[PDB]
Design a protein around this ligand. Structure first.
Ligand SMILES: Cn1cnc(Cn2c(=O)nc(Nc3cc4cn(C)nc4cc3Cl)n(Cc3cc(F)c(F)cc3F)c2=O)n1
Ligand SMILES: Cn1cnc(Cn2c(=O)nc(Nc3cc4cn(C)nc4cc3Cl)n(Cc3cc(F)c(F)cc3F)c2=O)n1
Lengths: 300, 300
């Protein structure tokens, strides 16, 4: 029992992290087979960071302009190319610690693990969700650019996020591993605002199911509701519309607990309308929305 | 910016985890140099688990009674011994992945990272605090016995916790790596109750400082208080007495923010007396007490 924000063990990713430097600009890269992937922002000097023309900047560089250090060992760069907002640096050595991996893009509302790194050295691991507005509420300091987010199934690491920048308001923005930003952001050092966010309804429901699996049942009630009258109340509270497909995914949790999805929705409506009254669910005084149904099943 | 429950990267520990089996009883072990450490409960058959006499049980075993599997490779057991509630199994192979390590016992109120494992295979990593009543509010299923908790400084892993059992109420109990239980528990399959718990005051204050470092300032106020009138209100709310030594440790956070410790205590007293009024601090609607001052500094 118990329920924690739980990350995947990070060792398979720690073995891929390297430092990349161009000029005096330095950040983290990801070394898989004989390629290092990193944010293209690394080719900016301080005077280029506000308004780079990356094709311009990159045509002015050669391979020897890029210093890649894997721990103590510098990796000889033997080729380079841009792919969207990531740089690919071919090196003369294949990483002997390369895991089985894939590059996957995730959906808003899905979770992943973040290995935060500084100067190529891993620092901490934590679980994060991609928000509906394509930001993540991460924990990142100066020097974390290039840190990666990932999931693991069996032995295979699905890389899904490369960290680029912190917005005003202090949330974080980045790309998938093909260099394509999540959300409407660009890799320049200008202030960019996140669009309005919403609460991930299916996740809140998943976490309420987790609570029942773990013996928190105080919020349950005898009522039910239709999908639609629920969405009418949800809309009021800045919750994502719940769809019949969300209902279908909650199926297995509904089965294991014997609580119909639309009955749990009735509990959710009352929690939204009454608050929690100084009570807690799974140690929280808020409705938690960064656990997917898969996370609940994986941990319960 | 941002503030998350952040664990240490787990790779150095993942490389030490093995499976130990005696009879039909199986759990996780820790392979460091040529020794495997695991809960002595592994020598219990189902009929022994309620009321074992471990010295009895162990004198009836030989080395070949212990099956140790490191991934696919079985480790030849060449000696065995009891140390308190841990078994030490000398094996014929030194673990080539052994990190620099130490066995340290932690204090209540301190934090560590838990690598949860099943059948010797690591499953997830998360951050936990040792509660004042020497339990931990972990996340652990059947098969997690022998999972370890740890901290990392530079390259050195300080192992501090080996998981043994889940209490009623669903909190977790275990030992340090010399086999000495945290708290007044014994390694038998009987129901044992945790003693009353308290809130870790110095940690709540540390986290309020983290909030200020991160721009949450709504809870600050112009008042101050003495150490003692604070402890009078704290006592009422089941908070640990705050000591002048706790005040001294908060020094560096007080410096970086310019907020006197006893002024932050005045904010805490008002938060305790008024509640949060449906507002949040660092995304939480509760006063969080599982971040030490070191965790705040490490992340802020
Ligand atoms: C507080 N914070 C939270 N997350 C981040 C991530 N982040 C970062 O780590 N570095 C950035 N700018 C750099 C400055 C450098 C100075 N030297 C010597 N080398 C440097 C390398 C970088 Cl990458 N930025 C800013 C930033 C990075 C981008 F990739 C981008 F497209 C726009 C940006 F404004 C940053 O946000 N810091
Ligand atoms: C739900 N939960 C949360 N944490 C735990 C940890 N835990 C565990 O993993 N296993 C336990 N008993 C075993 C049964 C076995 C059956 N087979 C085939 N092999 C087994 C090995 C164990 Cl270790 N227990 C119970 C338990 C383990 C102890 F070490 C102890 F001293 C007393 C106990 F009651 C357990 O709590 N499960």
């Amino acid at each position: 029992s118990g329920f924690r924000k739980m990350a995947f063990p990070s060792g398979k990713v720690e073995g891929c992290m390297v430092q990349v430097t161009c000029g005096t600009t330095t950040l983290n890269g990801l070394w898989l087979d004989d390629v290092v992937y990193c944010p293209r922002h690394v080719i900016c000097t301080s005077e280029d960071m506000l308004n780079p023309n990356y094709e311009d900047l990159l045509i002015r560089k050669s391979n020897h302009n890029f210093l890649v250090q894997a721990g103590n060992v510098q990796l000889r760069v033997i080729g380079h190319s841009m792919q969207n907002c990531v740089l690919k640096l071919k090196v003369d050595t294949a990483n002997p610690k390369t895991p089985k991996y894939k590059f996957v893009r995730i959906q808003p509302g899905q979770t992943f693990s973040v290995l935060a790194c500084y100067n190529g050295s891993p620092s901490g691991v934590y679980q994060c969700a991609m928000r509906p507005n394509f930001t993540i509420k991460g924990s990142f300091l100066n020097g974390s650019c290039g840190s990666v987010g990932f999931n693991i199934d069996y032995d295979c690491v699905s890389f899904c996020y490369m960290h680029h920048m912190e917005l005003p308001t202090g949330v974080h923005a980045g790309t998938d591993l093909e260099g394509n930003f999540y959300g409407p952001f660009v890799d320049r050092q200008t202030a960019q605002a996140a669009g309005t966010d919403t609460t991930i309804t299916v996740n809140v429901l998943a976490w309420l199911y987790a609570a029942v699996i773990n013996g928190d049942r105080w919020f349950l009630n005898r009522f039910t509701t239709t999908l639609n009258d629920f969405n009418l109340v949800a809309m009021k509270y800045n919750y994502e519309p719940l769809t019949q497909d969300h209902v279908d995914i909650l199926g297995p949790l509904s089965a294991q607990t014997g609580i119909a999805v639309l009955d749990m929705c009735a509990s959710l409506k009352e929690l939204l309308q009454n608050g929690m009254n100084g009570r807690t669910i799974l140690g929280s005084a808020l409705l938690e929305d960064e656990f997917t149904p898969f996370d609940v099943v994986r941990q319960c």
